[model samples]
Target: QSPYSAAMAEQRHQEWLRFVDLLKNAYQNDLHLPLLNLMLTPDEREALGTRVRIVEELLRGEMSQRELKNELGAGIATITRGSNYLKAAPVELRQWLEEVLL
Candidate 1:
């Protein structure tokens, strides 16, 4: 379903690999936040932070959606997307989130 040609996809994949490598290196050196701050605009950082918080709270699984909305002040649609992700995401992804963020 992707509009990208095979060559374009490869290029994007390579770029993603490099980006992830940068993150890994930064994380190991305790520079993850500084690197992210340098790369992301303040708005982009906040949006991503909100999404991660939503996912983490959803994983905690103690709160209703309304509770989450009131706690995080995120839109219902945004919280719904995180819920859908938790439902559909692989076990490894959820396990990693549980161990790292919970």
Candidate 2:
């Protein structure tokens, strides 16, 4: 078997936990609630949530078609249907989000 250090894994796990806690607190207190009503629409909120999920999966690792479908809760056919638009979507989404929300 390949060697792996338990201590190193534990250390990384703790760091991730701390990072998530900090991010959650900052998003809740400093980012979202303060301007919730003014900053987001229902459609925007859903799109943002989906985008965040996709980004998080990408950050973890490259996702295979099966994995992407499973993680995103969309069928492979539906996933492929959106591929072109998603690939070409404007970078303005992030700029608009930061300026209006964050």
Candidate 3:
């Protein structure tokens, strides 16, 4: 149903169902975002997670945007999204991100 072909959509649906099953077993009474995740396909959430991971690595200076863009074979948009996240992250969280340097 996406702009992608039916096979890709099928693959995405299977991944979403698998993620939903995992979440069902993993959390029963959690106050966090399981309800929110229910509204998204797992593909959507995984993409967001990928962005966060990239941004964390970027802030850690583990990889330059150019390097990640090349290595991940991602568009400039992906790197820009990560860069934007770093700018808005809280001071304490940013410090926590840096503490992993050890």
Candidate 4:
């Protein structure tokens, strides 16, 4: 019934479960730390690239989040997620972000 064969869907589900496990390990009770060394698929990298573009647009400082959707063919959810990341990014990194937009 699904576009994916059952076997293929099962494989994807298992991979996602493993990826979630990695995320859980990255956050211990006290802190959020980076996850490392679990090779990311190309789709994963591209999704991050889209987030980068969303961040870029955000620091440019005139566009509403509503106007940003579809500008780079990103979904509102993706754009909002990136917006949140920018809002919480470290000070030096936020400085780096502001530098690039100018």
Task: Name the candidate that leads on lDDT.
Answer: 1
Q: Between the candidate structures 1 and 2, which one is better when assessed by TM-score? A: 1
Clash number for every model?
0, 0, 0, 0
Best by TM-score: 1
Name the weakest run of 10 consecutive residues (lDDT summed) in model 2: 93-102
> Residue 64 lDDT in model 3?
75
lDDT values for all models = 0.90, 0.63, 0.74, 0.74
Candidate 4, lDDT over the whole model: 0.74
The order by descending TM-score is 1, 4, 3, 2
Residue pair clashes in candidate 1: none
Off by over 4 Å in 2: 1-34, 74-102
TM-score of model number 4: 0.53
Which residues of candidate 3, in runs, are more than 4 Å off? Answer: 1-37, 100-102
**Model 3 agreement with the true structure over 1-102: per-residue lDDT tens digits:** 565798988898999998787678656657338665676789888777776667666777777767887776667887887677788989998788777632
Prediction 2 global C-alpha lDDT: 0.63
The weakest ten consecutive residues by lDDT in model 4 span 29-38
The regions of model 1 sitting more than 4 angstroms off are 1-3
Q: List the candidates' TM-scores in order.
A: 0.80, 0.35, 0.52, 0.53
lDDT-wise, the better of 2 and 3 is 3
| Winner by lDDT between candidate 3 and candidate 1 | 1
For candidate 1, which ten residues in a row score worst on lDDT? 1-10
List model 1 lDDT by residue over 16-41, tens digit each. Answer: 99999999999999999999999899
